C-alpha cells in the first residue's frame, strides 16, 4: 500500500514540519491537537484537524485509542509520530500496524531491540562498533560495580538499561560512592521506567557528542546522510548542534560512517534514524545509542546534504528502495539553535507565558522551523521548545557570522528564552575554536561557560525610575536619526513638570508573597508553587512528616519539581491524586 493521507500524531514545530513535507509530497494531512493546542499553527496548517481532548499529554497525545480513533475518523492510512510521545513506543507501532495503517518509522522489533540499552550494546558488539569498556550485562550488586571500578580505575558511570532523557545516568568519582550511587540508580529506574536494571562503564572526562544520520531501507540498503556535533548540552539535552561534525580526522569520520551502517544492518533497522557516539579528548570513538525516530537535529543535515529526510521517511514507508546510492558530500556548514522557553539567567529553568511578539530573522542562509507565533500561549503542559533556527554558510566561519547576524535580529517577547545564551556562545572563543579544535564538551555550559545572562523580567517596573511613564520619539539632528525616550515628568531648562497634585513615587513591590521570615509557615497549607500536573504523591492522609519531607511532585514543561513539607506535623486534607492538574496556589494538603 502507498501513503495517501498522513496523520501527524504530535504537536508544534515537528507537526508543522511533517505537514509541510506531506504538502510537498502531495499527500493529505490530518492534525491531532489537545485542548491547550486548540489554535496552534499546525492545527490551522493541516488539511484537517481533530481534537483529542484533555489537557495533559498523558491523556491527549499518549493515548493509543484517541490517536487511532482520529485516524479512523479522518480516513488517514498512515501515521507519523514525529519525535517524543509515542514515536519510540513499540507497542504503539504494533497497534498502528495491526490497525492496517502504515506506521512511518522502524519496525516494533527494531524499536524494542534498540531501546533495550543492554540489547543495543549486544547488537553493537556483534556489529563490531567501537564501544567503551563496560559490563556487557546488568550488574547484580554494588560489589560487581566496585570490582569493575577497581579493575578499570575511576571515573565510572552507572546507567539504567532503559533510561532516557538524560535522567538514567549517574556518575561515580570514588569507590566509596559506588554502593550508594548504585542503590539510588536502582530505585530511580524502578520508579521511573519499571525495569530496575543497570550496568556500569567508564566515564569520559570531557567527551564530544557526534552522531550519524542514517537513511535505512526495507530492501537492506543503508546510507549515511552525514555527521553532526551536538556537544553543547544543558542537562544531557542538546541546545546547539552542527553539521557536519567539525574537527574530526578522516579516520574518525570513516569509522563513524561504517560503524553506523554496520549497526543498522545488524539491527535490521529501516527508516530514518541516528547513531549517537561519544568522542573523548583522547580521540577514541565509542558507540552510545541508536535513536529510532526522526531526530530534532535533522534540519542541519538536510541543509548540508540536500536531502529531505521526512520525504525519505515517506518513501521508505511506501517501501521503495532508496534513490540515494552513496553517502552525500556535505556542502557548507549549518548550525541549529533551539529556541526554548527557558531563562538562561535562572539556571535554564523553563516557564510558560504569552508570546506577545515573535519576529524571526530572514535573509541569506536562514531557515526557521517554529511552532509558535505572535499571540501564541505556552502553557505548563508540554515541552518548552518554541522553534529552531538553522543558519547555513559556505564554511564554519561564514556560518558563525551569519548566526551572529540572525540571532541579533531574532526577537521574542512575553517570556524568557535562550537567545541571550545563543548570542553569547556564537561568539565565545571556546566555541569558535582555533581552526583545528574547540574547547566545548557535553558539560561545558554548566561548568565552564561564563554565564552573564541577566534574569528575565519583561516590562515589569522594578526600580523607582521604572514607574515614570515614557514616550519614544524619532528625532533627526543634522540628518542622523535618533530615538529618544522622554519621561512624563521631565524638568529641563529651568521649567517643566507634571503630576503636581500630591503624587509620590517609590519602588514598586514585587507581585510575590509578603516576604515574611516564616516562609509560608504562618499557615498550615501546602500550596502548589506553580501550575503543573501531580505525578506522584509521597504522603498519605494522617501521615506524620517533618520539614523538608517530600509531599508531591509536580511536572511542568515535562520537568519535575518536588514540593516538600514546610513544617513538622501530621498530613491532613490531601486533595490531590496522581495525574490531577493543579494550579498555582492550589492547596495540596495541610500540615496540622
Amino acid at each position: 500500500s502507498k501513503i495517501s493521507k498522513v496523520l501527524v500524531a504530535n504537536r508544534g514545530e515537528i507537526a508543522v514540519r511533517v505537514i509541510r513535507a506531506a504538502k510537498d509530497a502531495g499527500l493529505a494531512s490530518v492534525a491531532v491537537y489537545a485542548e491547550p493546542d486548540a489554535d496552534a499553527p499546525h492545527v490551522r496548517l493541516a488539511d484537517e484537524a481533530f481534537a483529542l481532548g484533555g489537557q495533559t499529554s498523558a491523556e491527549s497525545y499518549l493515548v493509543f485509542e484517541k490517536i487511532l480513533d482520529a485516524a479512523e475518523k479522518s480516513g488517514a492510512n498512515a501515521i507519523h509520530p514525529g519525535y517524543g510521545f509515542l514515536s519510540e513506543n513499540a507497542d504503539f507501532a504494533q497497534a498502528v500496524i495491526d490497525a492496517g495503517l502504515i506506521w512511518i518509522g522502524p519496525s516494533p522489533q527494531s524499536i524494542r531491540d534498540l531501546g533495550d540499552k543492554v540489547t543495543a550494546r549486544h547488537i553493537a558488539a556483534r556489529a563490531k562498533a567501537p564501544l567503551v569498556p563496560g559490563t556487557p550485562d546488568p550488574v547484580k550488586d554494588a560489589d560487581e560495580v566496585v570490582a569493575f571500578a577497581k579493575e578499570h580505575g575511576v571515573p565510572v558511570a552507572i546507567k539504567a538499561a532503559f533510561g532516557g532523557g538524560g535522567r538514567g545516568m549517574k556518575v561515580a568519582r570514588t569507590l566509596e560512592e559506588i554502593p550508594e550511587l548504585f542503590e539510588s540508580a536502582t530505585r530511580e529506574a524502578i520508579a521511573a521506567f519499571g525495569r530496575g536494571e543497570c550496568f556500569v562503564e567508564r566515564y569520559l572526562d570531557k567527551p564530544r557528542h557526534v552522531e550519524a544520520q542514517v537513511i535505512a531501507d526495507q530492501h537492506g540498503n543503508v546510507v549515511v546522510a552525514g555527521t553532526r556535533d551536538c556537544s553543547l548540552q544543558r542537562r544531557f539535552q542538546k541546545l546547539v548542534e552542527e553539521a557536519p561534525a567539525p574537527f574530526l580526522t578522516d579516520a574518525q569520520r570513516k569509522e563513524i560512517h561504517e560503524s553506523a551502517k554496520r549497526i543498522c544492518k545488524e539491527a535490521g533497522y529501516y527508516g530514518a534514524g541516528t547513531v549517537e557516539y561519544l568522542v573523548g579528548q583522547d580521540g577514541l570513538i565509542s558507540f552510545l545509542e541508536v535513536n529510532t525516530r526522526l531526530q530534532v537535529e535533522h534540519p542541519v543535515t538536510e541543509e548540508t546534504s540536500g536531502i529531505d529526510l521526512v520525504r525519505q521517511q515517506f518513501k521508505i514507508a511506501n517501501g521503495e528502495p532508496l534513490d540515494i546510492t552513496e553517502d552525500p558530500t556535505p556542502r557548507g556548514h549549518s548550525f541549529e539553535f533551539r529556541i526554548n522557553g527557558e531563562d538562561a539567567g535562572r539556571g535554564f529553568l523553563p516557564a510558560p507565558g504569552p508570546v506577545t511578539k515573535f519576529v524571526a530573522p530572514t535573509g541569506p542562509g536562514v531557515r526557521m522551523d517554529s511552532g509558535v507565533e505572535t499571540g501564541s500561549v505556552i502553557g505548563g503542559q508540554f515541552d518548552s521548545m518554541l522553534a529552531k533556527l538553522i543558519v547555513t554558510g559556505a564554511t564554519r566561519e561564514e556560518a558563525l557570522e551569519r548566526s551572529r547576524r540572525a540571532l541579533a535580529e531574532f526577537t521574542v517577547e512575553g517570556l524568557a528564552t535562550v537567545i541571550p545564551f545563543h548570542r553569547a556562545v556564537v561568539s565565545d572563543p571556546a566555541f569558535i575554536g582555533d581552526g583545528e579544535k574547540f574547547d566545548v564538551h557535553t558539560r561545558w555550559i554548566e561548568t565552564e561557560w561564563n554565564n552573564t545572562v541577566e534574569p528575565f523580567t519583561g516590562g515589569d517596573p522594578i526600580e523607582e525610575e521604572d514607574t515614570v511613564p515614557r514616550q519614544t520619539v524619532v528625532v533627526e539632528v543634522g540628518g542622523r536619526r535618533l530615538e529618544v525616550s522622554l519621561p512624563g515628568d521631565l524638568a529641563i531648562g529651568g521649567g517643566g513638570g507634571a503630576a503636581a497634585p500630591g503624587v509620590v513615587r517609590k519602588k514598586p513591590k514585587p507581585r510575590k508573597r509578603g516576604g515574611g521570615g516564616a516562609k509560608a509557615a504562618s499557615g498550615d497549607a501546602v500550596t502548589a508553587p506553580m501550575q503543573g500536573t501531580v505525578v506522584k504523591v509521597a504522603v498519605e492522609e494522617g501521615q506524620e512528616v517533618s520539614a523538608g519531607d517530600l509531599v508531591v511532585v509536580l511536572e511542568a514543561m515535562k520537568m519535575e519539581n518536588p514540593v516538600t513539607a514546610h513544617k513538622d506535623g501530621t498530613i491532613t486534607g490531601l486533595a490531590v491524586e496522581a495525574g490531577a492538574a493543579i494550579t498555582q496556589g492550589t492547596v495540596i494538603a495541610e500540615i496540622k
Binding site: G514, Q531, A575, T583, Q584
Partner: protein, 172 residues
C-alpha cells in the same frame, strides 16, 4: 483608650491586654490562667482586639508607617497618590489569572494569588490577618489610589463567613 483607636499593633511577647490580672482572677473565681492565655498578643489578635502582632518595636513602627501611607491625614483631606499609571496594557501577570482558579469545585486555593495580580503591585497591606482568617481585609492601590479590599480566603475553612470574619469586614 486603646480599644477606641482604629489600629492596635502589639509586640509579641511584650505587649498584653486584659481588664483583670491572673492573680485577681484566681482570688475571685479560682481559675488558673497565664498571661498568654489571658491576653497575649496572639490571643488578642485571634479574638480581634489586636490588629497586628509584630516581633519588635521597629517592626511596629514600620507597620505604622505603611498603614499611614494609605490614608489621608483626616476625614476631609485626600490620601497620597503613589506610582499612578503603571502598566496600562494587559501583561503576562494579568494573563496568568485566566487559569488561576482550580478546575474542580472542591479545591481550595490561596486568594493572594489573585490579590497580588488585580492591583497596582504586590503592595497588598493586610490588617487583622489573624482575627478572621477566612476573610482578608487589606489596603491596596488602583492606579495609585488607595482602596480597601475585602476578600474571601478559600484556603481557610472553605472561605465561609464566620463571626470574626463578619465583624472584621464590618469594622473595616
Amino acid at each position: 483608650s486603646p480599644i477606641q483607636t482604629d489600629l492596635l499593633v502589639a509586640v509579641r511577647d511584650q505587649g498584653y491586654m486584659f481588664i483583670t490580672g491572673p492573680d485577681v482572677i484566681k482570688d475571685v473565681t479560682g481559675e488558673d490562667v497565664t498571661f498568654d492565655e489571658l491576653g497575649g498578643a496572639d490571643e488578642q489578635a485571634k479574638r480581634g482586639n489586636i490588629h497586628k502582632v509584630v516581633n519588635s518595636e521597629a517592626e511596629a513602627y514600620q507597620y505604622v508607617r505603611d498603614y499611614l501611607s494609605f490614608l489621608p491625614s483626616n476625614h476631609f483631606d485626600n490620601p497620597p497618590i503613589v506610582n499612578p499609571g503603571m502598566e496600562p496594557e494587559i501583561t503576562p501577570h494579568d494573563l496568568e489569572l485566566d487559569s488561576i482558579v482550580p478546575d474542580a469545585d472542591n479545591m481550595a486555593y490561596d486568594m493572594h494569588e489573585i490579590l497580588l495580580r488585580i492591583f497596582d503591585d504586590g503592595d497588598v497591606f493586610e490588617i487583622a490577618e489573624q482575627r478572621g482568617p477566612a476573610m482578608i481585609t487589606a489596603f491596596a492601590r488602583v492606579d495609585g489610589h488607595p482602596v480597601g479590599v475585602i476578600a474571601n480566603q478559600p484556603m481557610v475553612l472553605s472561605g465561609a463567613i464566620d463571626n470574626e470574619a463578619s465583624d472584621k469586614a464590618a469594622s473595616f
